[PDB]
Write an enzyme that holds these catalytic residues in place. Sequence first.
Site, PDB file in Angstrom:
ATOM      1  CB  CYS A 126      -0.971  -0.018   1.109  1.00 48.42           C
ATOM      2  SG  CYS A 126      -1.976   1.697   1.471  1.00 48.42           S
ATOM      3  CG  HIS A 164      -6.645  -6.474  -5.444  1.00 50.73           C
ATOM      4  ND1 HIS A 164      -6.307  -5.943  -6.686  1.00 50.73           N
ATOM      5  CD2 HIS A 164      -6.678  -5.422  -4.317  1.00 50.73           C
ATOM      6  CE1 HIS A 164      -6.274  -4.529  -6.604  1.00 50.73           C
ATOM      7  NE2 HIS A 164      -6.539  -4.274  -5.064  1.00 50.73           N
ATOM      8  CG  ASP A 165      -4.352 -11.649  -9.062  1.00 55.81           C
ATOM      9  OD1 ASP A 165      -3.323 -11.617  -8.341  1.00 55.81           O
ATOM     10  OD2 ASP A 165      -5.019 -12.606  -9.506  1.00 55.81           O
ATOM     11  CD  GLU A 174      -6.929  -1.282  -3.085  1.00 58.68           C
ATOM     12  OE1 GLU A 174      -6.589  -1.559  -4.334  1.00 58.68           O
ATOM     13  OE2 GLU A 174      -6.775  -1.944  -1.951  1.00 58.68           O
TER      14      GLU A 174
END
Length: 299
Positions: free
Chosen positions: A30, A106-107, A184
């Site tokens: 992040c 995640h992807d 996001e």
Amino acid sequence: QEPGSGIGYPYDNNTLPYVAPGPTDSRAPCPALNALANHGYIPHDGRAISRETLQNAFLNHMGIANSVIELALTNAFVVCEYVTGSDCGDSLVNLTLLAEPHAFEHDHSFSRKDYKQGVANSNDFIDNRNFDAETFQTSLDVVAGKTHFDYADMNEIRLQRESLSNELDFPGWFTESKPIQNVESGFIFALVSDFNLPDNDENPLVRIDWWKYWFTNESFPYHLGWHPPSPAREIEFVTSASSAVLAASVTSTPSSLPSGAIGPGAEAVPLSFASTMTPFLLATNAPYYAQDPTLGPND
Ligand code: HEM
Ligand SMILES: *[C@@H]1O[C@H](CO)[C@@H](O[C@@H]2O[C@H](CO)[C@@H](O)[C@H](O)[C@H]2NC(C)=O)[C@H](O)[C@H]1NC(C)=O
Ligand SMILES: *[C@@H]1O[C@H](CO)[C@@H](O[C@@H]2O[C@H](CO)[C@@H](O)[C@H](O)[C@H]2NC(C)=O)[C@H](O)[C@H]1NC(C)=O
Ligand SMILES: *[C@H]1O[C@H](CO)[C@@H](O)[C@H](O)[C@@H]1O[C@H]1O[C@H](CO)[C@@H](O)[C@H](O)[C@@H]1O
Ligand SMILES: *[C@@H]1O[C@H](CO)[C@@H](O)[C@H](O)[C@H]1NC(C)=O
Ligand SMILES: *[C@H]1O[C@H](CO)[C@@H](O)[C@H](O)[C@@H]1O
Ligand SMILES: *[C@H]1O[C@H](CO)[C@@H](O)[C@H](O)[C@@H]1O
Ligand SMILES: *[C@H]1O[C@H](CO)[C@@H](O)[C@H](O)[C@@H]1O
Ligand SMILES: *[C@H]1O[C@H](CO)[C@@H](O)[C@H](O)[C@@H]1O
Ligand SMILES: *[C@H]1O[C@H](CO)[C@@H](O)[C@H](O)[C@@H]1O
Ligand SMILES: *[C@H]1O[C@H](CO)[C@@H](O)[C@H](O)[C@@H]1O
Ligand SMILES: *[C@H]1O[C@H](CO)[C@@H](O)[C@H](O)[C@@H]1O
Ligand SMILES: *[C@H]1O[C@H](CO)[C@@H](O)[C@H](O)[C@@H]1O
Ligand SMILES: *[C@H]1O[C@H](CO)[C@@H](O)[C@H](O)[C@@H]1O
Ligand SMILES: *[C@H]1O[C@H](CO)[C@@H](O)[C@H](O)[C@@H]1O
Ligand SMILES: *[C@H]1O[C@H](CO)[C@@H](O)[C@H](O)[C@@H]1O
Ligand SMILES: [C-]#N
Ligand SMILES: [Br-]
Ligand SMILES: [Br-]
Ligand SMILES: [Mn+2]
């Protein structure tokens, strides 16, 4: 920045300098957590972090209200218990475990490679955690030659990232994650949309240079005129932006999109893992820091 610099004033009256992470420090997938840790607003070593430490750091140093990170906190602690095998209470063991794949991480990320991106063998994995310049450039190039972008542009960026990841990931690995990604997306509009435009609150446009500075440097773009949003952004703004991105008209369709990519996305909800399920091994790479150029304390 150095407290006496006044670089944050009057939005943040108690700043601390940027300090690059050392080889033993823990960093996250992040860019927000990494920036906070680099300034010591959460521990510089990236370990043993409480909910209140995170809340205060986001609110006082990034203009992000508690509502914005409520689910994120829940999910961080779910992932901590899953990875470590025991309840983490109110001390997040470290930031690195947040890169546990097919979970919170995640992807088709904007700026990180996927856990099994471009691996020749099924059992292999790569660094899905540190900032990757090449990957981020695939996001930026969707908006090449522009200073700002809107919801429709962000929709095109996440579609490009989904397409590339679906093509390049080891067969069977790729798993679409619209709900987490597009929260996001909302976070990006929340932090680095251009508050200098009269309609920012209702029609936010991302300032690309601010976005690029934040992600590449894992520090705050004060030198480019950025400051923490005031008043602090709330969850409503974020989820509204998320909706808007996914509702926006698609004018350029990439091939190799997963089924249902175009269209609305599910509400993001708390994660859960079967007690039987063993976690995937975490990438062990040293924490990334900007080197072209390296950053000083006020950067
Ligand atoms: C406790 C609070 C938070 C936690 C635990 C957390 C955790 C994470 C994790 C695990 C990822 C990796 C997802 C992936 O891209 O594969 C991520 C990505 C990301 N985070 Fe956070 N986050 C928090 C708060 C925030 C906030 C408040 C912002 C901005 C306002 C932010 C901005 C982002 C962005 C833009 C990404 C996507 C990076 C990319 O796709 O390259 N985060 N976060
Ligand atoms: C990462 O941060 C560095 C350091 O602040 C940036 O380089 C500086 O950019 C500022 C404006 O933000 C200029 O006033 C300085 O001339 C630059 N200083 C140095 C040492 O080069 C760099 O541009 C940032 N990277 C990105 C991608 O935004
Ligand atoms: C962050 O914490 C995680 C979880 O404890 C660490 O990953 C584990 O590290 C131990 C060795 O100390 C291994 O036995 C486990 O296999 C690891 N778990 C997984 C799922 O990979 C990780 O090393 C820590 N990272 C940092 C930089 O502190
Ligand atoms: C992380 O560390 C593991 C053992 O320390 C390695 O087996 C993994 O491949 C991974 O290595 C990468 O990161 C380390 C930093 O810990 C480097 O020293 C390696 O060269 C590699 O980049
Ligand atoms: C920073 O200090 C000034 C001067 O005392 C004050 O007016 C302002 O409200 C402060 N900012 C914050 C975020 O508290
Ligand atoms: C962002 O938030 C919206 C609204 O909850 C979702 O529809 C989207 O999938 C993403 O999670
Ligand atoms: C974003 O979406 C959430 C639900 O996911 C709403 O509660 C919020 O008001 C915003 O529309
Ligand atoms: C929800 O809120 C966002 C941010 O204000 C808007 O851009 C969107 O149109 C909706 O009203
Ligand atoms: C954003 O807006 C969409 C469309 O109204 C919703 O479905 C979502 O819950 C969020 O409020
Ligand atoms: C059609 O329009 C969208 C945004 O409105 C662009 O992102 C895309 O590149 C195409 O020109
Ligand atoms: C590209 O194509 C898709 C369907 O294949 C459309 O949904 C999109 O609007 C664009 O024309
Ligand atoms: C329009 O934009 C999309 C998404 O960036 C591309 O995949 C497509 O090739 C076209 O240039
Ligand atoms: C690959 O496929 C997409 C539709 O799935 C097209 O939009 C694109 O032009 C290419 O043929
Ligand atoms: C959350 O949900 C999962 C199943 O997806 C369970 O395994 C877990 O114990 C918790 O109930
Ligand atoms: C956790 O470890 C188990 C072995 O205990 C694997 O079978 C599983 O896929 C995961 O990597
Ligand atoms: C990062 O470190 C370099 C040395 O590689 C310095 O030149 C720069 O000022 C920054 O502190
Ligand atoms: C952050 N998600
Ligand atoms: Br690749
Ligand atoms: Br979905
Ligand atoms: Mn990812």
